[PDB]
Write a protein that binds this ligand. Sequence first.
Ligand SMILES: Nc1c(C(=O)N[C@@H](CC(=O)O)C(=O)O)ncn1[C@@H]1O[C@H](COP(=O)(O)O)[C@@H](O)[C@@H]1O
Ligand SMILES: N[C@@H](CC(=O)O)C(=O)O
Ligand SMILES: N[C@@H](CC(=O)O)C(=O)O
Length: 299
Amino acid sequence: SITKTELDGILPLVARGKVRDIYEVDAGTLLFVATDRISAYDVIMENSIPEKGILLTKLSEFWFKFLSNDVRNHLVDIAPGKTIFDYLPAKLSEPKYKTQLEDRSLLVHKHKLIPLEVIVRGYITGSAWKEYVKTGTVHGLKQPQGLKESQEFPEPIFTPSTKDENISPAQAAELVGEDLSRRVAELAVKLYSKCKDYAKEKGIIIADTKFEFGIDEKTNEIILVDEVLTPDSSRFWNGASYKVGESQDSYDKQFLRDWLTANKLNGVNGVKMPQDIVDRTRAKYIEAYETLTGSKWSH
Ligand SMILES: Nc1c(C(=O)N[C@@H](CC(=O)O)C(=O)O)ncn1[C@@H]1O[C@H](COP(=O)(O)O)[C@@H](O)[C@@H]1O
Ligand SMILES: N[C@@H](CC(=O)O)C(=O)O
Ligand SMILES: N[C@@H](CC(=O)O)C(=O)O
């Protein structure tokens, strides 16, 4: 497993998120490295899930391609017969560094930020359900009465947050502009509905998802950026066992979650997962990848 990338200053680090290490390649280009780190109850585990970041990188790439005729994206085009390593300093091809980067790294164009977490919810769960139980609203938006936990909304809804506080679409328009916010909300719902319909047919319900969007202002054009419709950016549910009126198991994280709670380790830093938990969680990522892409992992 790749837990933390160590590139010895060959490229400068921009950020380390929960799961992604980002490096600056040049003035216009970034390198997004998905590690095998995993989070639960808002803390990362001490050890990692081997090849998780390769699986989620490939899943994100799958969705980018699936949506390529719906939305422009930030991916740098790799010439045929070339690899990402051809676009990186020569040192990064040395075995010490190539092992940390291969199959889990994406070369991306820097675009102008749209500073919103563009969340779309097809089903009422998570912080939407919590609010709705209290006040019958979701991100301050008025909702129909009588919704049950995990129920599908009449239509998927744009419910933004700021990097995390849940905000209304009207606040999103204050933050990024009235016209832009509307275009963003409309595109997000469209992209979500298309992918959700496809995933459900494959047996996975994507309950909600967090997109990040950018803008190429030289051509006023919305760009799909960040990771796309993975179990880290979205809520994956088993479609066959779906039941309204209760919480659904996390498709990818329930085995881990169950272990943590059983040991009162939820929210605790520095927790090492036992091997059985690691192995089963890994197998769950492979299954999601194979189910959604149609590709075989390891065969
Ligand atoms: N909430 C997450 C999370 C997350 O918290 N993951 C846990 C992992 C876990 O315990 O399951 C972590 O430890 O960070 N990741 C993404 N999203 C996305 O955020 C969108 C809104 O989620 P909310 O919880 O506010 O309904 C919603 O569209 C997405 O689900
Ligand atoms: N390939 C273009 C995007 C596109 O062709 O849609 C870019 O990297 O900016
Ligand atoms: N029409 C927006 C500008 C934008 O969409 O960026 C505004 O409220 O100024």
